Design an enzyme around this catalytic site. Structure first.
Site, PDB file in Angstrom:
ATOM      1  N   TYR A 141     -21.570   7.607  19.534  1.00 59.81           N
ATOM      2  CA  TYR A 141     -22.210   8.714  18.850  1.00 59.81           C
ATOM      3  C   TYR A 141     -22.138   8.511  17.339  1.00 59.81           C
ATOM      4  CZ  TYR A 141     -22.207  13.523  16.863  1.00 59.81           C
ATOM      5  OH  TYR A 141     -22.376  14.643  16.100  1.00 59.81           O
ATOM      6  N   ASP A 182     -13.290  11.953  24.879  1.00 51.33           N
ATOM      7  CA  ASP A 182     -14.267  12.984  24.548  1.00 51.33           C
ATOM      8  C   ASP A 182     -15.152  13.199  25.760  1.00 51.33           C
ATOM      9  OD1 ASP A 182     -16.458  14.549  23.697  1.00 51.33           O
ATOM     10  OD2 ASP A 182     -16.567  13.569  21.715  1.00 51.33           O
ATOM     11  N   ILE A 234     -17.272  15.825  26.479  1.00 56.23           N
ATOM     12  CA  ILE A 234     -18.220  16.897  26.192  1.00 56.23           C
ATOM     13  C   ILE A 234     -19.425  16.878  27.127  1.00 56.23           C
ATOM     14  CG2 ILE A 234     -19.473  15.558  24.438  1.00 56.23           C
ATOM     15  CD1 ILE A 234     -19.823  17.975  22.811  1.00 56.23           C
ATOM     16  N   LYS A 247     -22.830  21.169  24.963  1.00 56.38           N
ATOM     17  CA  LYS A 247     -23.786  20.385  25.739  1.00 56.38           C
ATOM     18  C   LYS A 247     -23.935  20.908  27.160  1.00 56.38           C
ATOM     19  CE  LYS A 247     -23.871  18.107  22.067  1.00 56.38           C
ATOM     20  NZ  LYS A 247     -24.937  18.380  21.069  1.00 56.38           N
TER      21      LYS A 247
HETATM   22  C1  PPG Z   1     -19.758  12.673  22.009  1.00 56.17           C
HETATM   23  C2  PPG Z   1     -19.927  13.885  21.109  1.00 56.17           C
HETATM   24  N1  PPG Z   1     -18.844  14.516  20.651  1.00 56.17           N
HETATM   25  C3  PPG Z   1     -18.966  15.579  19.855  1.00 56.17           C
HETATM   26  C4  PPG Z   1     -20.209  16.056  19.521  1.00 56.17           C
HETATM   27  C5  PPG Z   1     -20.250  17.282  18.613  1.00 56.17           C
HETATM   28  O1  PPG Z   1     -20.647  18.373  19.381  1.00 56.17           O
HETATM   29  P1  PPG Z   1     -20.138  19.906  19.024  1.00 56.17           P
HETATM   30  O2  PPG Z   1     -19.142  20.297  20.081  1.00 56.17           O
HETATM   31  O3  PPG Z   1     -19.455  19.973  17.651  1.00 56.17           O
HETATM   32  O4  PPG Z   1     -21.308  20.862  19.092  1.00 56.17           O
HETATM   33  C6  PPG Z   1     -21.329  15.439  19.980  1.00 56.17           C
HETATM   34  C7  PPG Z   1     -22.672  16.036  19.553  1.00 56.17           C
HETATM   35  N2  PPG Z   1     -23.804  15.188  19.853  1.00 56.17           N
HETATM   36  C8  PPG Z   1     -24.752  15.122  19.035  1.00 56.17           C
HETATM   37  C9  PPG Z   1     -24.746  15.881  17.710  1.00 56.17           C
HETATM   38  C10 PPG Z   1     -25.756  16.613  17.270  1.00 56.17           C
HETATM   39  O5  PPG Z   1     -25.694  17.253  16.010  1.00 56.17           O
HETATM   40  C11 PPG Z   1     -24.947  18.443  15.937  1.00 56.17           C
HETATM   41  C12 PPG Z   1     -23.483  18.175  15.568  1.00 56.17           C
HETATM   42  N3  PPG Z   1     -22.685  19.358  15.862  1.00 56.17           N
HETATM   43  C13 PPG Z   1     -25.934  14.208  19.339  1.00 56.17           C
HETATM   44  O6  PPG Z   1     -27.107  14.528  19.031  1.00 56.17           O
HETATM   45  O7  PPG Z   1     -25.694  13.109  19.888  1.00 56.17           O
HETATM   46  C14 PPG Z   1     -21.189  14.340  20.786  1.00 56.17           C
HETATM   47  O8  PPG Z   1     -22.245  13.602  21.346  1.00 56.17           O
END
Ligand code: PPG
Ligand code: PPG
Lengths: 419, 410
Positions: A134, A219, A221, A259
């Protein structure tokens, strides 16, 4: 005199906004697609967001204050961490169990990974991260921490999965280079591959982390977006099968509701650590990035609704798998192969056969054509540090059936011209 | 066995400290009117409940909104709300508003932006004990105290700023700014407009930043006694002066919503605005919360009246406790803002020392079952002072707590 000075961190580009991942999103904002009044506009396929299941939440909340406003305790609402722990057990199908007292909430996984990096690695130390990964990790893990990323190289021979020789090579090369390694951070299932990690690979990885005496951050998610529950192996399952707390102490899970539930705006992240000192330390540190007590209170009842979470998770897996098949079979009609994926909000698309030669600037030229003639924003694989050029991450979960079909028309229509 | 980082094993989390030892002790025997009025009464936490009834009498698109600009409606509401607090004496452009998860996040984030690891910020003593963690724990930045004493009600002097700066020079520590609390925590006192202008001139001459944490701005008892650094900047014409001023605010104290984690940075420096906004990705406000509060915080009718009434109740609550403490023979410093009073118990001291102050602090926690903050945890330069919070409790609970102190002086 000069203008009052800012810090090294403040003038660094490590925020990552000089990058193809950000420019393509910016090109989307200048001319966004719309079915009704801009069908020529840019279709957004570069953002990993999940809308395919959101109607289940809308239907659910239809059918159904002083206390939360004053609650700012860094543990988070006990009620909500029970909802979070139970939701995470449902995602893993009972192959793991989560103590709510070990749940640490953060404003999204963006916060969680930076926070964990603060805890496990000193400035100028390093974390091992399998490529491709990522792009946001290049900011999240590095910008404010002084911590470095050492890649674990992966290639198409084994579908970009970790091999023991690549773990040993990444570790030893850094150690021979006087770089101190503190752990491995994996994405399980992978972003951008959309692929689970095989159980034996995680077991060897955990063994490797024991032998080098380093940490393992997983991770997870996209764990609730694995197409079939039985194909996912969380590191929680590998650790639950071990009463050796000496082994457990190096394994940490990052999760978020952005997600799987499609609630990125609410910023609900969590750290689940099997290390009691990481728990106590992460929680104190979560003061800098706490989750709104309002949303914790709102989501607690919904995420504890065992009837509803069972249904949501089952249905979300099927709709994502269904979009994956739609887009992978659309691309096969156009003569385009994808990696076989089994999770996530994106497919990993191989366009290396359309390139000048296998070079980075050839991949960006092609990306420019897809962004400007085809008006599709997708992510170039080199911004994910892929070791092979020409791969592209294509998100499929943030759009209507028809918008996906039109995007497929443009690509199929583009391959007919290039033949 | 696994190693953690220096940050992880550091003491800078600040919990091996009386501010968190007493807050701990409260949880093991917490007071409750219904089923435990002999329990520990919490007076060590600066929270505001005295106006909350005024709030009580008052989806797919939100869930998907994760932009670090924040909701435009909510940035408009925050900016107008901050203008109303200052009585139109300053103007806030909603496009410069950067949201963070509380002011805890905002001060740390600004510290990342304004100072390198092993640089320092000047902080007037006594100061909020949480700064010892927030400004230092993850940043590698140091706090150099600006000493203040009771002779001028613990206010900044141009001389104290200058010797504090010299102290850092002797230690080969580079000073990057001054962080003040305006109005003060723990003093509960506005800063005089003259003092803030002299502070700003000092920051200009040394070419350093000035951070004004104005989280208690809406809790000034008499609105005209408050001078925001925003008012001072509104009437400066030199951009070299403006560019170093940054305001931190939060809805935790004035609105009594600490759990929602709404902080903001308002910086007059465009690159700090842009950098803070990128950095706010690590600590964004829930879009649900931005949306709910945008409508309420833009209702100027409700907000103008909320602010007025909250000032009056905090003043009267201030009057209730200070006159309660005088009846028991205890003096408080003259305060005019905030959620706490500054109490001198220096006359009950065993040896006019820090050991003596904590020993006495131990008595009020054990025997009186009262958690209050010892002034040495605020780095006060004089021993025997205590911060006592008065807005995180009922009318009834405050009276009971006063009675316990009154009997102890017998
Ligand atoms: C593997 C991974 N970890 C953490 C995050 C951050 O997500 P959060 O829980 O903070 O919402 C992403 C977000 N993935 C993306 C990020 C997008 O932009 C927004 C960042 N918050 C993407 O398009 O691959 C991710 O793919
Ligand atoms: C000057 C100042 N800035 C920021 C904060 C944090 O506010 P928030 O992050 O909610 O916006 C406080 C909280 N001060 C106290 C609150 C403590 O609660 C627990 C965290 N230490 C106190 O007791 O003095 C404060 O006094």
């Amino acid at each position: 005199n000069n203008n009052v000075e800012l810090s090294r961190v403040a003038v660094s580009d490590t925020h990552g906004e000089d990058s193809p991942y950000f420019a393509g999103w910016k090109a989307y904002d200048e001319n966004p697609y719309d079915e009704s009044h801009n069908p020529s506009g840019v279709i957004q396929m570069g953002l990993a967001e999940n809308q395919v299941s959101f109607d289940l939440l809308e239907t659910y909340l239809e059918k159904k204050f002083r206390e939360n406003a004053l609650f700012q305790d860094y543990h988070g609402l006990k009620t909500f961490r029970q909802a979070m722990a139970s939701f995470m057990e449902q995602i893993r199908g009972g192959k793991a169990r989560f103590d709510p007292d070990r749940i640490v909430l953060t404003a999204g996984a963006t916060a969680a990974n930076e926070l964990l990096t603060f805890i496990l690695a000193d400035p100028n130390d390093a974390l091992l991260v399998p490529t491709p990964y990522y792009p946001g990790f290049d900011r999240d893990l590095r910008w404010r921490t002084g911590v470095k990323i050492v890649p674990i190289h992966c290639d198409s021979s084994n579908h970009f999965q970790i091999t023991p020789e690549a773990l040993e090579s990444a570790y030893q090369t850094a150690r021979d280079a006087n770089i101190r390694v503190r752990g491995v951070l994996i994405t399980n299932p992978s972003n951008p591959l959309g692929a689970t990690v095989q159980k034996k690979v995680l077991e060897d990885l955990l063994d490797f982390c024991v032998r080098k005496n380093i940490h393992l951050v997983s991770d997870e998610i996209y764990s609730g977006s694995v197409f079939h529950a039985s194909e996912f192996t969380s590191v929680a399952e590998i650790v639950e099968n071990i009463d050796d707390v000496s082994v457990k102490e190096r394994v940490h899970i990052v999760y978020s509701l952005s997600k799987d539930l499609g609630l990125p705006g609410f910023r609900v992240g969590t750290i689940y650590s099997y290390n009691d000192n990481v728990v106590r330390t992460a929680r104190r540190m979560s003061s800098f990035t706490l989750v709104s007590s309002q949303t914790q209170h709102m989501l607690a009842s919904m995420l504890s609704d065992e009837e509803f979470t069972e249904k949501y998770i089952r249905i979300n897996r099927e709709r994502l798998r269904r979009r994956y098949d739609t887009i992978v079979e659309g691309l096969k009609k156009a003569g385009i192969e994808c990696l076989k994926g089994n999770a996530g909000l994106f497919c990993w698309m191989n366009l290396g056969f359309l390139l000048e030669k296998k070079t980075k600037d050839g991949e960006l030229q092609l990306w420019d054509v897809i962004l400007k003639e085809l008006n599709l924003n997708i992510s170039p694989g080199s911004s994910c540090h892929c070791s092979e050029v020409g791969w592209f991450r294509v998100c499929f979960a943030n759009m209507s059936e028809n918008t996906l079909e039109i995007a497929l028309k443009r690509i199929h229509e583009f391959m007919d011209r290039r033949r």
